[PDB]
Design a protein around this ligand. Structure first.
Ligand SMILES: *C(=O)[C@H](C[C@@H]1CCNC1=O)NC(=O)[C@H](CC1CCCCC1)NC(=O)c1cc2ccccc2[nH]1
Ligand SMILES: *C(=O)[C@H](C[C@@H]1CCNC1=O)NC(=O)[C@H](CC1CCCCC1)NC(=O)c1cc2ccccc2[nH]1
Lengths: 303, 303
């Protein structure tokens, strides 16, 4: 029993983290085979953060301008190139700790683990969701750029996020490992800001199922609703619409608990219209939306 | 910016996890140098869980009754002994991945990271506090026994918890790595249950400071209180008393924010008597008590 925000074990990613320095800027890089991946804004000086032309900035660089350090061993850079908003630094040594890996872009509402790093040294690991507005609510200080987000399946690491910047509201923006930003954000200085966000409905329903599996039942009721009537309520409370595919994805949890999805939707409707009346669910006084149905199944396998 | 429940990177502990089987019972062990540590209840059969005599059960065992597997390599057991509620299985190979380590017993109100494991394979990592009643609110299924809790300081792992059992309320109980239980719990079948718990006041104040550092200020006020008047309120709301040592420990966070500790105590008094009036702090609608002052400083270093 119990239900925690749980990250994947981070050792396979720890063995990939390095430090990259260009000029006076230090951030992290990801070393896989003989390539180190990092944010291209490592090459930007304070004097040209408004409208950097990265193609020009990079043409003016040589391999020796990039200092890469893996633990206390310097890696020699033997090529450099840009891939969208990431740099690829070819080094003369393949990482002996390279795990099986993939580069996968995730969807809003999906979750992943972040290994926060500074100076190429891992500091902490935590779980995050990609919000509907393509930001993440992370925990990142100066120096954390190049830290990555990932999921692990069997022994394969699927990297899905590299950190680039913090927006004015304190949420975070970055790219996939092909260097393409999540959301309408750019690696230059603007007034860019997080757009309106919404709550991830299917995840809230998954977490209510987690709660039932863990013995929290007070929010259940004898009612059911139709999908259309539920989505009218969802729209009123800034929740994403629930689709039949979402209902299908919740099938296993519904079977395990014996509570039909539209029955649980009636509970969620009542929680949105009435609140919790001083009670808690899985130790929270808010409806939690950063657990996917797969996260719940993985963690609450057989109660 | 941002504030997350963050665990320590788990790779140094991943390299220590093994599987231990005795009879039909499989759980996890911790392999350090040439010793594997695991819960002694691995030797208990279903027929003697009410009043096992572990001294007798172990005298009837031989080394070959213990099957230890590290990845897909079997380790040969060459000695066995009991240390309080842990078994020590001497094996014929020193773990080449042994980190620098210590065995440290923690205090209630202290936090640590748990590497949940099954069949000697790490599954997830999360942060936990030792409650005042010496339970932990973990996430553990069948097979998780022998999973450990730890903190990391520089490159030294301080192991502080090994998992043994779940209580009837769904919270968890275990030992330090010397095999001594946290709290009034035993590794035999009884009606034992978690005793009354309380909220960790100094941790709530630390988290309010984290919130201020992260831009949540709505709960601040112009008032201050005395320590005695605050502790009268604490007692009414089942909070631990706040000591002058706690005030001293909060010194750095108070200096960084410019908010005196007894000024923040006045805010906490108002939150306990009035509630939050529909607002949130660091994404929570409850007062959070599983971050220590050190956790806050480590994560919110320089905003
Ligand atoms: C890389 O390590 C950091 C990570 C920041 C630091 C604080 N918290 C984080 O996540 N990235 C930055 O500091 C970027 C660097 C820019 C260089 C030029 C191209 C764009 C990225 N800057 C910011 O994250 C930043 C600047 C800024 C100014 C005003 C409001 C918000 C804001 N965010
Ligand atoms: C080891 O892997 C497990 C971990 C449990 C499983 C479910 N969640 C956990 O944390 N440990 C157990 O199953 C113990 C084994 C006992 C063997 C004999 C000596 C004491 C431990 N049992 C329990 O955790 C347990 C049994 C039980 C019965 C009734 C109410 C609660 C309860 N808890």
């Amino acid at each position: 029993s119990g239900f925690r925000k749980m990250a994947f074990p981070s050792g396979k990613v720890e063995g990939c983290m390095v430090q990259v320095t260009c000029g006076t800027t230090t951030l992290n890089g990801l070393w896989l085979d003989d390539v180190v991946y990092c944010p291209r804004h490592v090459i930007c000086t304070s004097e040209d953060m408004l409208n950097p032309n990265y193609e020009d900035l990079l043409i003016r660089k040589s391999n020796h301008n990039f200092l890469v350090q893996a633990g206390n061993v310097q890696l020699r850079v033997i090529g450099h190139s840009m891939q969208n908003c990431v740099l690829k630094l070819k080094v003369d040594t393949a990482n002996p700790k390279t795990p099986k890996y993939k580069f996968v872009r995730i969807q809003p509402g999906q979750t992943f683990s972040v290994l926060a790093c500074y100076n190429g040294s891992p500091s902490g690991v935590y779980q995050c969701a990609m919000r509907p507005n393509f930001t993440i609510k992370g925990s990142f200080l100066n120096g954390s750029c190049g830290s990555v987000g990932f999921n692990i399946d069997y022994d394969c690491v699927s990297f899905c996020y590299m950190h680039h910047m913090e927006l004015p509201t304190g949420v975070h923006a970055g790219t996939d490992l092909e260097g393409n930003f999540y959301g309408p954000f750019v690696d230059r200085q603007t007034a860019q800001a997080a757009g309106t966000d919404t709550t991830i409905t299917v995840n809230v329903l998954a977490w209510l199922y987690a709660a039932v599996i863990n013995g929290d039942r007070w929010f259940l009721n004898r009612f059911t609703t139709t999908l259309n009537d539920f989505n009218l309520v969802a729209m009123k409370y800034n929740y994403e619409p629930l689709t039949q595919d979402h209902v299908d994805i919740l099938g296993p949890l519904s079977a395990q608990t014996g509570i039909a999805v539209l029955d649980m939707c009636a509970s969620l409707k009542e929680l949105l219209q009435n609140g919790m009346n001083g009670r808690t669910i899985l130790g929270s006084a808010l409806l939690e939306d950063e657990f996917t149905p797969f996260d719940v199944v993985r963690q609450c396998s057989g109660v």
